[PDB]
């Protein structure tokens with residue numbers, strides 16, 4: 023709740039302020055014919071949904087598409103999901119969830 | 122040998138299911154169950170054949186004779202089986218699977234094809250049967266309770282609160298209430314169908330009882346429908362009455378010493394014919410017999426080497 | 441929000457802002473982005489005309505090239521949105537003369553960052569857009585042969 | 589010092605180092621972020637073919653798994669004590685349901 | 694010989710491998726019997742309105 | 757061919773001339789009809805077992821999964837021990853053991869499944885022609 027939480031708040035505000043800058047680089051990445059074949063597991067229908075999910079995470083509308091979350095609330099939900107025991111236990115053994 | 126008015130069985134990670142009697146602590150028989158762990162076991166209404174299900178197979182065991190092998194086994198599913206049950210007449214078997222499918226099996230070895238498959242979007246944890254054997258309840262990991270009716274092929278979806286997975290659900294045999302618990306301890310109760318004629322399957326939120334701060338694991342009614350026992354992860358079981366839903370009796374296995382730190386959870390419970398004695402199975406490698414009035418235990422069964430997470434306890438209908 | 445009615449309105453506001461104070465980065469970049477956004481919306485609508493995207497594509501190319509020369513050091517987004525229009529709508533004749541003048545206008549040491557995106561689409565099967573890539577790649581080799 | 593990689597597609601890794609370069613610039617011109625010295629460490633990535641590449645070698649860096657391993661073996665502590673406890677309590681750990689895996693974990 | 698022992702050895706477990714009845718799940722059902730489903734798995738035994746009291750005789754001989 | 761079809765079904769499913777390369781010059785019994793004066797051999801349930809026995813022999817020539825193929829061959833000799841009791845199958849298997857290449861342990865597994873056979877057809881005809 024000290025350096026970690028405050029650093030997360032600062033970073034998220036920067037990313038949401040510059041949404042277009044990080045969207046432009048990602049669009050040129052996903053829409054590459056010879057580089058998206060590994061993510062393909064119409065032809066470009068899956069590419070549309072990948073970009074939409076990315077846009078949702080940078081606008082707050084990721085946990086629930088109905089409402090828009092602010093930065094302090096979004097970070098709180100991410101922290102709860104990342105350290106929940108139910109999510110950690112399902113991980114692979116070599117992933118070392120207990121570590 | 123199952124030729125007794127009352128039988129009792131427990132199982133867990135020991136890979137062996139132990140048959141006991143309530144008269145004395147002696148273990149009557151030990152059946153063998155390899156390469157799996159038992160999620161929940163239930164006995165057939167004909168009291169001649171018991172069911173144990175775990176990890177994609179429902180191995181069925183004999184009771185009249187002494188056979189340590191799974192004489193009948195079922196396969197076909199790809200994930201674990203949450204629970205099993207049978208019709209009152211022993212016609213079909215309904216099973217709930219973690220593969221998001223709750224289906225029905227046919228007990229007749231001829232081409233009846235009396236099987237139906239119900240598919241939901243989340244893995245399910247508990248399945249219950251309405252006392253009229255015309256309805257069925259499916260509970261998933263999203264907190265959505267699907268009341269599925271057999272006359273038709275449509276199921277109402279009812280969600281009390283999202284983001285929390287429910288663990289168990291049961292209906293009193295007298296068809297009076299309908300309780301369910303989730304992963305936070307809240308025990309929601311809805312008044313069940315009042316339409317005995319055409320099965321209008323209407324539900325209203327009656328009450329919410331705040332208890333079991335830790336996880337809630339199983340909830341079961343009593344044959345007289347006057348009690349309701351809910352297990353919890355805090356190693357305590359609380360018995361509620363159906364009059365004003367107050368705390369009737371509190372049961373606990375905590376040792377009171379900080380050096381144990383939740384030695385083991387309390388998994389399942391079962392009532393007797395007269396709703397006087399209850400049988401509890403905890404994850405401390407043993408099961409206990411309690412009394413709903415004095416609180417202090419009556420007997421203890423300690424033949425298992427590993428934790429036990431399931432128990433089956435039935436007796437004569439008269440009581 | 442972005443509306444069929446709103447889009448024409450804000451272009452009047454943005455266009456009037458550019459002429460009042462030129463050499464302002466936030467005036468050119470924003471106006472160029474709005475035209476680009478308008479193009480995207482129209483394309484989605486008619487897939488659910490060649491002369492209905494033409495009055496929007498040409499200003500977008502011109503607006504971006506002016507902003508690239510006006511940032512000079514933090515123009516990764518601007519130099520990357522030009523490629524998107526170039527690789528998808530550059531086959532019309534009217535787009536070419538906008539691009540060929542823009543490429544010559546801006547300093548050559550700006551395309552260094554977008555080299556991996558340029559090499560990806562060398563094999564474009566449209567001759568009209570295919571050759572324009574070759575000339576600037578060779579021009580980079582004239583000045584910076586050992587980075588390519 | 590480099591790291592010649594084989595049977596790996598590094599064309600994706602090239603495009604994520606470019607993204608990290610953009611993020612570093614964004615954090616550099618922010619007064620509240622520049623003062624905190626926030627940055628992402630990058631290494632050179634040079635693909636040579638569709639299944640080969642050349643990753644730069646970062647010095648003075650050791651992986652987390654080997655870092656913990658040296659500490660535990662020095663203190664006469666087994667590497668997988670937590671894993672051995674879980675298997676001892678429930679040998680069929682990989683097959684337990686969601687609720688039972690929480691109890692063991 | 695080698696396989697002669699193997700042939701008779703494989704016969705030993707075959708005797709104990711036929712003591713289990715296996716019932717697989719065939720993907721067939723009463724799909725077209727929509728009307729017949731009103732009684733095949735829809736008995737709907739709505740009854741047992743009369744309640745009966747008990748004298749605690751289940752555990753009377755237990756303890 | 758049976759090699760292709762078998763991979764979509766099972767041995768029990770199908771049940772609910774088979775000698776491919778069997779011509780009248782490379783058989784132990786059929787070659788003696790004309791030169792010696794033998795009698796024709798005598799006899800659908802046995803025609804689907806010859807294909808299964810043969811197709812397992814070819815699959816045993818690659819040694820990729822030997823244990824699986826050996827197990828599949830021992831079951832047939834248990835459930836149907838009389839299918840390895842025709843000389844026509846022995847000639848077909850022996851003709852195949854020459855053209856193909858088998859490992860020595862896999863070569864001894866074959867040619868030894870046929871050790872305890874009577875082969876009554878040759879004895880009856882050989883006795884008559886010589887007498």
Ligand SMILES: [Zn+2]
Nearest residue numbers: 783785786844
């Ligand atoms: Zn022949």
